Write a protein that binds this DNA or RNA. Sequence first.
RNA 1: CUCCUCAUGGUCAGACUAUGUAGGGAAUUUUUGGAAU
Lengths: 39, 49, 49, 99, 36, 73, 135, 1063
Amino acid sequence: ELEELEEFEFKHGPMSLINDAMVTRTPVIISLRNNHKII
Amino acid sequence: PRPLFMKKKANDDARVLQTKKENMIKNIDKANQVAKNYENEELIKQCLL
Amino acid sequence: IKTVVLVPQLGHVGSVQISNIPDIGDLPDTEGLELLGWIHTQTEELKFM
Amino acid sequence: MKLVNFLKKLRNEQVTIELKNGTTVWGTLQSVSPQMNAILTDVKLTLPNIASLQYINIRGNTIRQIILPDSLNLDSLLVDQKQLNSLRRSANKRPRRGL
Amino acid sequence: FNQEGDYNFKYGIPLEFYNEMHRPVHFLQFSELAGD
Amino acid sequence: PVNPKPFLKGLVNHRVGVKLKFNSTEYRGTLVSTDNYFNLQLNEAEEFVAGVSHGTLGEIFIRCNNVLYIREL
Amino acid sequence: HYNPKTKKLNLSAFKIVYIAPLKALVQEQVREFQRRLAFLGIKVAELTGDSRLSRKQIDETQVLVSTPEKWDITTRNSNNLAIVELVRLLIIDEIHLLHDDRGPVLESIVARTFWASKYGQEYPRIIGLSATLPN
Amino acid sequence: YFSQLKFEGFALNSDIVFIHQNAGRLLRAMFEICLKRGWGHPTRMLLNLCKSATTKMWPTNCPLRQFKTCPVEVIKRLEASTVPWGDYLQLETPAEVGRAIRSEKYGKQVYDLLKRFPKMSVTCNAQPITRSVMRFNIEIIADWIWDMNVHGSLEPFLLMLEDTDGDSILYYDVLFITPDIVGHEFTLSFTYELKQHNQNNLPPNFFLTLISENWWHSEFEIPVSFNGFKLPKKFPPPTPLLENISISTSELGNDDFSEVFEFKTFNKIQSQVFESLYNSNDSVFVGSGKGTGKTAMAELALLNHWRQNKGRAVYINPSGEKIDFLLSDWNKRFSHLAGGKIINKLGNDPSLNLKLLAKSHVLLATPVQFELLSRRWRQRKNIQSLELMIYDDAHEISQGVYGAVYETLISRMIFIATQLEKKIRFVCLSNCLANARDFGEWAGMTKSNIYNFSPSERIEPLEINIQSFKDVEHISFNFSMLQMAFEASAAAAGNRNSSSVFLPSRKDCMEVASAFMKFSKAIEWDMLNVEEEQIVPYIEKLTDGHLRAPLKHGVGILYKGMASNDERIVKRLYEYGAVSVLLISKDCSAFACKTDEVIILGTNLYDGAEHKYMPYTINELLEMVGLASGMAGKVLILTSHNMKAYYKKFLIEPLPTESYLQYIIHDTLNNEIANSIIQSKQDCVDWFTYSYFYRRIHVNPSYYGVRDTSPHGISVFLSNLVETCLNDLVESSFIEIDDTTEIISTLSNGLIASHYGVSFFTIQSFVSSLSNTSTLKNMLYVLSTAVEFESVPLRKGDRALLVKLSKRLPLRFPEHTSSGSVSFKVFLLLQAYFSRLELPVDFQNDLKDILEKVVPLINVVVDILSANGYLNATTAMDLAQMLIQGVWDVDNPLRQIPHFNNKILEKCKEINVETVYDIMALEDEERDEILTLTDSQLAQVAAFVNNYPNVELTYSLNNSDSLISGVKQKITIQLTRDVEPENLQVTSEKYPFDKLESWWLVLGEVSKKELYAIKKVTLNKETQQYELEFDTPTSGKHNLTIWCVCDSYLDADKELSFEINVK
RNA sequence: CUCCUCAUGGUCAGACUAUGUAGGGAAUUUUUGGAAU
C-alpha cells in the first residue's frame, strides 16, 4: 500500500513535470547550480 | 452395451519424520564426536579392563 | 515377485547383518503387498541353509 | 527506481565525471558505491594541466554529473530493479492445450 | 548401521556393492594420502 | 494550529511568487502542486531577476532546497 | 569501417581474427594488440582454450586472438555464423604450421572460409604470416 | 584432479593440466554419446563424472563445496559426519541445522544456502494415448530460491525417462529452469512409443530421474507408476473407400439446389457418404479429412434438412474466424435459393444470441457460445425444438478444456433427445480418428451410419516431409531451420508452385521476412515474378507499418490484427502469383489460403503462462497442412527430434480422441444442478451415462486413472469423482445437500455462476477476494484473476512491454500476485482500454479476446456483491459501464459519445456542455459545427444519441404509513423512456462485439453501505412498471436511495432518494 | 562495496560476529549542497 501511495503522490505532485517529460519524450531545460543550463 | 452406474457404491506424520531425522542426525553427531575423540595402549588397556 | 526391497545391511564373507522388516506402506504401487521372503548371495553349493 | 543501481551497472566503463567544484575526471569506473562513491582506475584528472593517477575514489556527493559513452544501452540498463522486485514478489482445467 | 532401527524407503535404482556412494572413507583417505 | 502545509494547500490554485535564497531569481506563476518534501510546481511562470521581468518560462519545477520563501500575489 | 572525420569507432561493423598456434603466444600477442590499439578504444580479448570466452563477449569484442583449434571449433558451430560473416579480417600467423599435424586445422579453416559461406558470399581479407619457406 | 591434488613433481602436474583443459570435454562427449545410444547405467555415472570435472569434487564430498561463500570448517565437518544428504536438505529450522552440523555458528548461513540449493518436489502421471503411444504428464515444482551469482543465467536440468532396471533410456530431454519458473507448478508433457514385447507385457513402473548439469547430488527420482494400466485394443481400420464416382448434382431432388456448389461431380469421399447423408434423415458420422470438403458435406446436410420443411439448423465450429468466412459464403447463396431462410452468426450476448435463435433459421456459433445459450433447454423452449445439428470438427473435442465444453454440449443434446423423445439429427463432421467409431456409438448412431476414413484416402497425394533439428526445443527456430525453409521456398519459386511458411508470431514473421530478403538479395532469385513498378500501386495504403518493405521483394506478411485491406492485398498478390511466398502466423490458420506447397517453421510457440515453449497441437498442424495441394502436395515440417515421433505418427495415422471432462466436471455438474434436472446424486450418475467421457473411460481406463476395469469399478470410480465435485460445491456454497433419495438445493452463488457459465474455480476466486468495502481497483484485479484468460497468448515481449506500458496506466497491480501470469496482462489491457493508448497490433488481439470474456465475468462481479448485500455494487456497475464503453467515470462523460477526441471535446467545453443529455437537445447546425468528420461516424453518433434514453425514475409505494420491520415490502417502480426502441443494439467503437442494452434498478442506504434490493430489466417498451419485493430494514428512520443504472452507457445514472420510518 | 535498521543463528553479562528474495543510506552533526560571483 505504501508503495502505491508514494507512486501516486509522485504522479500528482510537482514531480509530474519530469514524469510527463519521460512519457512524452519531450525536451526540458534545467537551470543548474553551476550557472549552466541543460536542455 | 454399457450398464448403468450407482452413486451409493462409493459412499503430524511429517513432523515425526523430521523429528526422528533430527534424532538420527544428533545421535550420529555424538557418535562422530566419539570417533574424533578416539582418533602403551596394551598395558593401559589392560589396566582399564 | 514384483517388488524387490533392498535394505540396510553390513555383509561379510559367508555372513551378513540385516535391518528389520521394512515399513513400505507409504509408497505408491503398494496395495497390500505381502512379505514373501528374502534373497541372498553366496559362494558354496549347498542343498541346505 | 534507484539510479545509483544504474551506476552500479557501470563497472569497466570509460566516463568523464564533472564535479561540483568544477573538476573534470576521466577514467574507467572500477566500481561505484551506493553512496555514488566512484572508484576508478587509469584516471586523467583536471582540476580547474592533467594529473595521471592509478586509482581515484570520489565521494558521491561531490559528483556533479557523469558523462557516459554514447554506445551505452540505456534501454537495457534502466530496466532491472523492476524485474528484481517482480522476482522478489514471485485445480483441474490446467491444459487449455490438448494432446 | 543399526540392526534394529527405522529407515525411510523409496523407489529407485540400487548402486554397486563397491560404488562411490558406498566408499566415502576412501576419498578422505585418498586425498589424505597426499595430505592437506 | 495553521501549519505551513495547510496554508500552502490553500495557496494551491492561486497566483504566487517564490523568492529563492539566491534572490537571483523570483518566480511568479499559478501554484499547481507541492509535495510532502515541499518541491514546487508552477504554471505560466514568469522570472523576475533583480526585480525586473526576465521572461515567461511556463510550467516550471522548483527544487525545494532553493526556496527561501513563497508569498501569495 | 571507421570514419576519418567522425572519431566514433564503428564497433559492430568489423570483426578481426588472429590465428596464433599457441596459447602463450596468443597471450603475448593480445597484450601487444592492446598496447597498440588502445587509442581507438578497442577490446582485444582471447577466444581460445584457457581464455574461456562465452556466447556474449564475442559479440561485444572487436579484435580476436585465437588458437587454430578453438577458432576452428567456434566457426564450425552453426549458430554463430553471424559473427563469422562479420569478421572481415582473418590473419593467419605461422602458416608454415601446415607441415606439422596441427596445420590440417588451418587448411580446414581456410576451406570453410572460402567454401562454406556462399549465402552471404563476401570473402574476408586473408593474410598469411610465416617463416620464409619454398613453394 | 577430481580430488584437487596439486603436485610437487611437475611432470605429473603438466599432464594433469592437459587433463584439466580437455577432460570435461571428453567426458561430456562420452555422456552425450551414451545419451544418444539410450544406455541407462553409463549415462547417470557419466553425468556425475562430467559434473565432477566441471566442479572439481566427488559425490562423497558434499555439494556445499561448490558454493563460493560456504566455509571450510563446515564442509570438513559434513564430510566427516557420515550423514545422508537428504536429511540435511530436509532440515528446516536454522538453529536446528546449526545443532545438526554441531557448530552453532554459521548455521543460519548454511540454511540460507540450503534454500539456495536445488530442491524439487516432482510428480509424474503417465497415461496411454493409444496402445503403442504413451504420454507422460510431469508436474515439476522447484522449491529453491534463486541467486544470480551462484546459479548463473538459468538451470539446465536433464530429465531422464528410463526403464524399470535403469538399463536403457526410453526418452530424454534437457529443460531450462529459469528464474521465472521456480516455485510455480510447472507441467511438462511428452510422448513415447513402446516396444512390441513391452507393449504385450508392461512393467510395474518406469523411473523418471532429474539431474542437474551443475549442482551436485540433486538426484530426484520419482517412480512413474504402472499398476493395472491396461492398454486399449488394436486400432480398428476405417471404412473402406469403394470405387464409385457416379454420384453427382443430378441425383438430388430439387434443381434449385444444384446451382449451389459451382461444380457438378462430387468427390470420392463425399460420393461414399452421400447416400446416408442427402437421402435419409438418420444420425450420420460423416468424418474425415481437412482437404475433402467438410464444408460441402455440411452444406448437403443443411439442404437435406430444409428439403423436409424443418428449418432450424445449428452449425458448430470452434474456429470463430472461419465461422465468419463461412457465414459470408453461406448467406449470399444458400439463403436466397430456399428463398426465406435466415442465416446468422451468434454474438457475445446471451440475450442477443437468443433473439437471433428465434429470428434466424440457421445459427452459426462456437461451442462455448451455443453451449452457454442452450444451457437452459427447459426454460428456452426454442432449443428443445431444434431438429438438425452439424458438429463441425468434432476432433477438436480433444483440444484442452474447450473440447470438454464441446462434449458437454453434445452430451446435453443427446440427453435432451432421450428425455424429450425427440428426433434430432446429429451430423458429426470430424477429422480422421482411430477411436471414431466409439465416438459415433455414444451419439446414438449405428456402425452402418458411421464413416471413418484414413488420412491417406484424400485425393491430392501429399508428401509430409518432417525434418528434425538439434537444440531447438528451447527456441522458436534456429538458423539451419531458416536456411532449409529458404531452400524449399526457392524450389517452389523456381517451379510453378506457390509456397507459404508459418510462424509463431508477428515478431517472428518480421524476423523471418528480413532474413528471407537477405538470403534472396545474394542469390539470383529475389524475384516477385512481376515488375517492381506494379507493386507500389497495390500497397499505396501502407497499413501494417512494416508490411511494405518485405512484400516489395516477394515475401508477404500475414497475421491476425492486421488492417484488413492490407491483408486482402497480400492475399490477392498470392492468388495472382505476385507474391510467391507468404508468411502466416499461427492464429491465422483459420484464414485458408490454398497453396501449392506449405512450409512449417518451428513447432514450438511460447506462452508466458506456461513459462516455456510448448509444441503445437497436431490440430493446428492439420489446419496448417490443409492449405497445400498440387503438382504434388508438398509439406515441409521443421521439428525437433523429441517431437518427430509424435508428429510423424499422428499426422499420417488418425488422431486418437479423448475427453477432458474430468477437468471441467465441477462446472458441468454445477450447471446440471442449477437446471435442476439432477435432483440427486443417483440422477447425476445417470446423467454421466451420457458423456463421451463414459465410453472413453471404459475403452481406455488407464488414461483417466481408474485402475479397476469392470462395471463395478467404473461405477465406484465415477461416484468418487462426482462426490468430490459435490464437496467442492457445498464448501463453495454453490449447493446444499441434506438427508431425507437425497435432496440437493442451489444457492445464489451457484445460480449466477452456472447461468453465466463462469468456471467453478473463477467463481471461488471471486468469492475469496470479494468482500464489503472493496474498491474499484480490487474489483478489477479480481476480474483479471480468472481461468477464462488461459487462452490469451504471450511471448516475452508482451510481458516486457507490459512493464514499459505500466508507466502510462491509471492503476497498479497488487504486489502479492505474479507479474508473468496472464492476469497482470489482462489488467493492463483493461487499463489500455479505459485510456485509449496506441497499442501494438499484437496487443489489440489480446484486448479483443479479453473483451469477449469480460462481460459475463463483470456481470458476475456485480451480481455476487449484490448477493452478499453490499451497496458498493454501484462501483461494480460503473466498472461494467466502463467495459461496455471504454471510458472512466470521473475522466469525462463527453468521451463516451462515439469517436470523440481531445480537440472535439474542447468544443463541447466551448458550448459548456457537461452531461450527454444536453447533446440530445442540440440541433443539427451546432452538431455540424462541432463534428467535421466522415458520414459513417456521424451516423453511429446519431444512433448512440437516439438509443441512449433520457429515462425518468419514478416510484409508487404500497403503504407509506404502514411500515413493518422484517416483512417483504413490494414497491412498484414506474420507468419511462424517451424513445421506444426499434432494436436494443449498443453502439461502441472500442468494443467490437455487439451488445443488447439492459438496466439495473438499485435500492440501498449510503452510510451503512448496504444494498437492500436490485433487479435487472430489459426495457423493450417505452414505459413499464417493475415490482421490487424487498425486505424492510430495522426500526426507525431509514434512507433509501434508488439508482437506475444502465449496463452499457455511462452518465445514465438517475437517482431518487426517499426515507421511510419503519416500526 | 560500505554503514544503519530489522530479522535471525550463535556466544557473553544490552554488546559482538556470520547469513538474509528484507527496509533503508533528499528537512539541522556528514551522501542529495548556502552555493554562486
